[PDB]
Design a binder for this molecule. Structure first.
Ligand SMILES: [Mg+2]
Ligand SMILES: [Mg+2]
Ligand SMILES: [Mg+2]
Ligand SMILES: [Mg+2]
Ligand SMILES: [Mg+2]
Ligand SMILES: [Mg+2]
Ligand SMILES: [Mg+2]
Ligand SMILES: [Mg+2]
Ligand SMILES: [Mg+2]
Ligand SMILES: [Mg+2]
Ligand SMILES: [Mg+2]
Ligand SMILES: [Mg+2]
Ligand SMILES: [Mg+2]
Ligand SMILES: [Mg+2]
Ligand SMILES: [Mg+2]
Ligand SMILES: [Mg+2]
Ligand SMILES: [Mg+2]
Ligand SMILES: [Mg+2]
Ligand SMILES: [Mg+2]
Ligand SMILES: [Mg+2]
Ligand SMILES: [Mg+2]
Ligand SMILES: [Mg+2]
Ligand SMILES: [Mg+2]
Ligand SMILES: [Mg+2]
Ligand SMILES: [Mg+2]
Ligand SMILES: [Mg+2]
Ligand SMILES: [Mg+2]
Ligand SMILES: [Mg+2]
Ligand SMILES: [Mg+2]
Ligand SMILES: [Mg+2]
Ligand SMILES: [Mg+2]
Ligand SMILES: [Mg+2]
Ligand SMILES: [Mg+2]
Ligand SMILES: [Mg+2]
Ligand SMILES: [Mg+2]
Ligand SMILES: [Mg+2]
Ligand SMILES: [Mg+2]
Ligand SMILES: [Mg+2]
Ligand SMILES: [Mg+2]
Ligand SMILES: [Mg+2]
Ligand SMILES: [Mg+2]
Ligand SMILES: [Zn+2]
Lengths: 156, 96, 66
RNA sequence: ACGGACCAAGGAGUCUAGCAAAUGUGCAAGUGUAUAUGAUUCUUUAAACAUUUUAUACGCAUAAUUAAUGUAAUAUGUCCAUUGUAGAUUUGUGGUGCCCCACUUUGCAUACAAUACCGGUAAGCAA
RNA sequence: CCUAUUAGCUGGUUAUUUUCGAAAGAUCUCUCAGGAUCGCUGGAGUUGAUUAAUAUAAUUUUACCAGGUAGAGAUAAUGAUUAGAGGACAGGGCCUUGACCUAUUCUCAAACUCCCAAUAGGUAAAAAGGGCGAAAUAACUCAAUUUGUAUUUCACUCAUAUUAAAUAAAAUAACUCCAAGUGGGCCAUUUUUGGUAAGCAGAACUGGCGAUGAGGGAUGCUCCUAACGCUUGGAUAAGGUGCCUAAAUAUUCGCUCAUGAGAUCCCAUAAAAGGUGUUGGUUCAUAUGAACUAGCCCUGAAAAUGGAUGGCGCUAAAGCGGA
RNA sequence: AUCCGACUGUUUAAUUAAAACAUAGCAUUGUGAAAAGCCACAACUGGUAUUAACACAAUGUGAUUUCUGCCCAGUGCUUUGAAUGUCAACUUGAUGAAAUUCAAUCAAGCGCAGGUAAACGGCGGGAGUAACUAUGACUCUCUUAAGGUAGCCAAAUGCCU
RNA sequence: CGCAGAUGUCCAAAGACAAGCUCAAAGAGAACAGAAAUCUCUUGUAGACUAAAAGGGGAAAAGCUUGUUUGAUUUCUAUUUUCAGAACAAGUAGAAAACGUGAAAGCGUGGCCUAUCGAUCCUUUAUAUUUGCAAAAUGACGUAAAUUACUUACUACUGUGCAUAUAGAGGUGUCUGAAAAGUUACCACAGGGAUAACUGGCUUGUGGCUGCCAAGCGCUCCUAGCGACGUAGCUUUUUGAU
RNA sequence: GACUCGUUCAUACUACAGUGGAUACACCAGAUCCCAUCAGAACUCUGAAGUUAAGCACUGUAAGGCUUGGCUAGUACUGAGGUGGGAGACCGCUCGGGAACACCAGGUGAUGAGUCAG
RNA sequence: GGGUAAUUGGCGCAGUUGGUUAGCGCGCGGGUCUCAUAAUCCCGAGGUCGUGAGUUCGAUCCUCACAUUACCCA
């Protein structure tokens, strides 16, 4: 018959890496979390309490609940013509602060002073990012002794 | 499965504390002839129509669950608890 | 006679006919079963704030209409 | 693969009960003159017209909840009409063309939340 | 007579034009020729947008994340597997063959792994919001009537007209209600399981046939171009220009002679092994002798009514490879 | 000359005339009567019966000749009963305010103990051994309720054939 | 009706907590003692063990040995897996109460994680200062007064039997859950080329026919005639497969 | 010159060697008491005679391992197109992406908070 | 599910009977008339299906083989 268990098909997903076994470090227990934060769900198999389900390994969400040792996360999931919000309750070892946001934060902080300076001198500032574009012309100096001629090779 | 005859646990009736209980086993009990369902069935079975209700025959299980009966020793109120199904059950025996 | 037993041929054409719909993006959600001893305190805070606001508004009304 | 030699006439989603949604009409915290009775109604009329000379026939609605004895919607400080975010319309200034912006005023329908109260259950007390 | 008994099963089911337009998956079922439920479709109605904006997107970019398939390895673990070499408990009385150890050596894995792509995925890219201060409310938290944390109130301020990265017949949007028909499918490229194989049976992504006609493939449900109101004129695609048949017996280079030549997707069969046929090329030996290589042609090549590059026919091609 | 049926007789109107049915002969079973055997009927009443064991009723086999072996464990049928387990209503007793509840007892059946196969039916394997080989009178061993006897045969009954 | 396998169980500890410890194996050495009894020492990333299939996890531990225990306890929410985003079932994060362990921070709502199971109706026992049995009463005339009686006021606690609310159990393995033996060679009806028994079609394993190489046969001599070990085809006069 | 609590979790590990002791870290001297065993070995308690032999710290091996570059190599593999080649098995072209083992060379750490001596 | 019987040396069984208890045959060896010495006497290993108030029970609350007949709404 068919075999659809809770941990079926996770032979390689839920296994430790080479020469990297053992339980987590002590600083993992000092991480700070707040409501509305972005977070990554990465299962750690050496802690068997409160593991996430197979599908959610590697997804990102927002925090909607904090407890003694647990965090609730809001995660999207595709079901056949729509996307549903899922409420996932996991323990604190399977939780990592998300890094997907940092460029926006640095951009805001850095653009603040540029705006403040430009308005202080009453200049015109453009702060939106620029897509890579076509390249301008230039004059390239090259001695004739440095150009090497090539040609196709014979077969061997 | 070996379960001792006494046990100190929480009492949910009349004294909300851990007290000393006695443990025994629950048994069904005999159907009484004056209950409403049995009166209805006995009236339906009279007359000229043969059997009137289903009779089960396709038996599959070989065990039963082992619900225990607990009884507080300060107050004399009782309570039930269910265990997983087993084949051999003993109430106070020689330890391993 | 046998028959087919599975295919999901043509299923995502049907899925894209009315597109992939999305969640709704509301501003508040219900705190029914969430962290207690924290939202009861919040109820007290908001009752105190509302009391102060209503008392000031009512007093202003009382003196304005005289 | 089955029906069809030809022509004319006939030939198949309807009626009644009961419920709902949609839409048109009348009145509106009410609405519907039941069975009957009345009349200077009586070819048509088996239709139409009327209602018993501080006004208790009945149905549905106006209040829920519980097996049930039953109990029953802020509360008298003010005839006032619970709270917040977005939001139609209105009020006062300025900008570009009665319209759109900015500030200001009011805050429908509705969406998302909070709070108070009524019936059942659990908990803590309990004549 | 009850009686026009009952049928998840065969057969039939009557005027026109216009507009929109499917499913042959899935869950449960004394269920497998049925049904209910979701999905796909139509019709009503409101809320919005109409401001080259915002909501939005089967698409990219910038930042970040997760992976163990293709490949590789066997001197890295597990499991297989050929052979010698060098060293310090069995053996016929100082040597067989061994055993043990050390460094090598030939070859492997859907249910092996030190490593690890391409493609395919997910989150983010600012106004109901962000930043920085002060004050007020708590029965929560803390050693703390200041420790913190929500929430609330006031101040100041964060690019826009080029719109906090590009592009967009982006609002043809969002949401309620009432319902039909479907729930036997098949085919093609690429990936892929069973089988000697099959116009066999079973899966994945996409495009189609079905439900669809037009030009081409002689002919043909699924191949190529291309999808459809009634016309006039112009210029093409796919494919063709000796006659059948509209348009080159066009131009410019090579190759080929067949007493069963050859003639282009799907497509309508041919191999090992041979040739002192002819045409190019490579490597050896003083103007000969060899050994290889690959284009056309030939041998290998046997079935039943009389027959098929579509037919006639074609050799200074009307054949094959180019311009 | 072989097979089948003893013979005369009968049969599927309209695809089968036979080896099929009947038959004389043989065997078994029930019953001494209006309170009996077998059978009909809603009830009252009837058939055999104007009968009486050399009779009526129910079966099997199928002339004559010569024969009819072993098994009562299984399933049927049948015989004895207060020594005897189980087995209804009614009835009797105890308790209780009463409805109830609890006890006890010689019905038939089954069980216990016997009979019966011209009732339904059943009736085995392995190994060694005699002066050339071959065979096995003989022996050992497992085992059944009983182990296919007199006969007969590649038969309308034998696959291999 | 692909491949290699497993399930209808088992455990008062094989559950909870804490502490100490380190395992398989090899080498050297010690009376009887030897290939293997019990003793020291060196090395030892798990090569052991962890109830039962296979996969994942585990070293001052999740393994071994001890000590104390019954968190395998009562009540409620937000939710994940299958999915219609229904039930059951099996899980994750928490709240109120009473406890175990440890010096303490803490941990504990069964078994280190992934399987080990069940509706309506009926029956059966537990719980309650909650109810009923259609004109009424049943503890009790209880406690205070007063009579010349149908007197007055106060009270949480009131007959047998039955019914009912809430919680567990008695089972449906065809496991979203009917009380169910055969035969038709005497046969009937509605249908099916959705499906068997012929010809035809694709395939060619099997059947049949033809090839290539050269070990060897042929006294001698590969090839007059043959041709083992291996290899490429053809046909539809066999039988299969669909 | 040394110590306590940490962070990276092998450039930090492993095998052999060399060097060091103002204070500190150790080995070390004992068992009355708290405590612990077959065993004061370990664990617990009370001390200050001796020593850098060992732990520990720094350095050295054409050391093993680990780590960073170069090469292997535009090789193996692969997304999109093709009325492309070839009986097939398989293999080029156009628009794009791009490994692994091995081999060669360098390296063997860095750091937060708080104290002691001088 | 209900009623009845039954479990006692190795084998077949007696007993078993409240301050009373456990035996016989058979099976296994010893001394024995020692011409089958048949027959045999004295000896030993030998046991209550298991629980418990109440003392001394085989009385009695329960489950565990087996046998007989009858019974059945999840
Ligand atoms: Mg037909
Ligand atoms: Mg016809
Ligand atoms: Mg007509
Ligand atoms: Mg209406
Ligand atoms: Mg009230
Ligand atoms: Mg009082
Ligand atoms: Mg009819
Ligand atoms: Mg259309
Ligand atoms: Mg049909
Ligand atoms: Mg993955
Ligand atoms: Mg591979
Ligand atoms: Mg390889
Ligand atoms: Mg088309
Ligand atoms: Mg063609
Ligand atoms: Mg034209
Ligand atoms: Mg022409
Ligand atoms: Mg020569
Ligand atoms: Mg042609
Ligand atoms: Mg032509
Ligand atoms: Mg005759
Ligand atoms: Mg005759
Ligand atoms: Mg006839
Ligand atoms: Mg005839
Ligand atoms: Mg006859
Ligand atoms: Mg006769
Ligand atoms: Mg005869
Ligand atoms: Mg008999
Ligand atoms: Mg009797
Ligand atoms: Mg027979
Ligand atoms: Mg014989
Ligand atoms: Mg003969
Ligand atoms: Mg491991
Ligand atoms: Mg431990
Ligand atoms: Mg454990
Ligand atoms: Mg079923
Ligand atoms: Mg089912
Ligand atoms: Mg029948
Ligand atoms: Mg067919
Ligand atoms: Mg063949
Ligand atoms: Mg030294
Ligand atoms: Mg090195
Ligand atoms: Zn109690």
């Amino acid at each position: 018959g068919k075999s659809r268990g809770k941990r079926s098909g996770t032979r390689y997903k839920f296994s430790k890496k080479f020469r990297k076994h053992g339980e987590c470090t002590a600083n993992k227990y000092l991480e700070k979390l707040n409501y509305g934060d972005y977070v990554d769900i990465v299962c750690d198999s050496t802690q068997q309490k409160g593991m996430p389900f197979n599908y959610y390994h590697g997804k990102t969400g927002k925090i909607f609940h904090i407890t003694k040792r647990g965090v609730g996360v809001l995660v999207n999931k595709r079901v056949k013509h729509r996307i549903e919000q899922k409420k996932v309750c996991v323990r604190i070892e399977h939780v990592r602060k998300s890094r997907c946001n940092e460029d926006f934060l640095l951009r805001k902080i850095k653009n603040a002073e540029l705006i403040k300076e430009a308005k202080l001198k009453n200049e015109h500032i453009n702060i939106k990012r620029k897509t890579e574009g076509p390249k301008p012309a230039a004059m390239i100096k090259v001695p004739p002794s440095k150009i090497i001629t090539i040609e196709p090779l014979p077969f061997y | 499965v070996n379960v001792p005859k006494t046990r100190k646990t929480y009492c949910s009736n009349k004294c909300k504390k851990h007290t000393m209980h006695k443990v025994s086993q629950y048994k069904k009990g005999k159907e009484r002839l004056s209950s409403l369902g049995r009166r209805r069935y006995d009236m339906k079975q009279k007359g000229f129509g043969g059997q009137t209700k289903p009779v089960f025959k396709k038996k599959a299980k070989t065990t039963k669950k082992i619900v225990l009966k607990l009884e507080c020793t300060k107050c004399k109120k009782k309570r039930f608890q269910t265990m997983k199904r087993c084949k051999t059950f003993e109430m106070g025996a020689d330890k391993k | 006679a046998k028959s087919k037993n599975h295919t999901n041929h043509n299923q995502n054409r049907k899925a894209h006919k009315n597109g992939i719909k999305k969640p709704k993006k509301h501003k508040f959600m219900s705190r029914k079963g969430l962290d207690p001893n924290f939202f009861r305190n919040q109820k007290y805070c908001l009752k105190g704030i509302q009391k102060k606001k209503k008392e000031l508004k009512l007093k202003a009304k009382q003196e304005k209409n005289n």
